[PDB]
């Protein structure tokens, strides 16, 4: 008798897990290739220490995570429970991100 819990049990339970855990999410080699690719524009043929790639990973996840905190408060303040891109644009504008 297959029966999925619902739209929200995987969500809220998985929010309890991925808030509860500590480790770094987005994978090492695609992120590393990303930083090298953006790095090629300002200067050719760079080199990275590995821990610096972990550092850009950590600040990048913390900045995105804080952005989803705030855009979540944005869309909840519209009596919605779903992030939509104009909410992202709002928090980037409200915070001051929007140049």
């Amino acid at each position: 008798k297959p029966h999925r819990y619902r739209p929200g049990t995987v969500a809220l339970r998985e929010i309890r897990r991925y808030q509860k855990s500590t480790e770094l999410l987005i994978r090492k080699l695609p992120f590393q290739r990303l930083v090298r690719e953006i790095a090629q524009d300002f200067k050719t043929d760079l080199r990275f220490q590995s821990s610096a790639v972990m550092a850009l990973q950590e600040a990048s996840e913390a900045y995105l995570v804080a952005l989803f905190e705030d855009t979540n408060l944005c869309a909840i303040h519209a009596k919605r429970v779903t992030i939509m891109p104009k909410d992202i644009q709002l928090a980037r504008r409200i915070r001051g991100e929007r140049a």
């Binding site: 969500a11 929010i15 994978r27 690719e37 760079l46 600040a59 990048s60």
Partner: protein, 86 residues
């Protein structure tokens, strides 16, 4: 060989479930459809500023290798200070 190394998503790397995992660390229940492309854009802008500023610190010492102190200092200057590396 490379066995299908075609990174493909030139920058998509941050797969759709990876942005899901960061959003669910942020406490986000339901994610719309165009969120992912804009998320790649915002992450791209943030990394462009951070390593644009970091590569200049690596250029001033006339060194060809970016270190961890480089990016922690350049993060500090943008008001986003990050301990645990120096």
């Amino acid at each position: 060989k490379r066995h299908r190394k075609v990174l493909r998503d030139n920058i998509q790397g941050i797969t759709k479930p990876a942005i899901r995992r960061l959003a669910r660390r942020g406490g986000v229940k339901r994610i719309s459809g165009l969120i992912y492309e804009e998320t790649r854009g915002v992450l791209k802008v943030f990394l462009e500023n951070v390593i644009r500023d970091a590569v200049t610190y690596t250029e001033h010492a006339k060194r060809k290798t970016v270190t961890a102190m480089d990016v922690v200092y350049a993060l500090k200057r943008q008001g986003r200070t990050l301990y645990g590396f120096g």
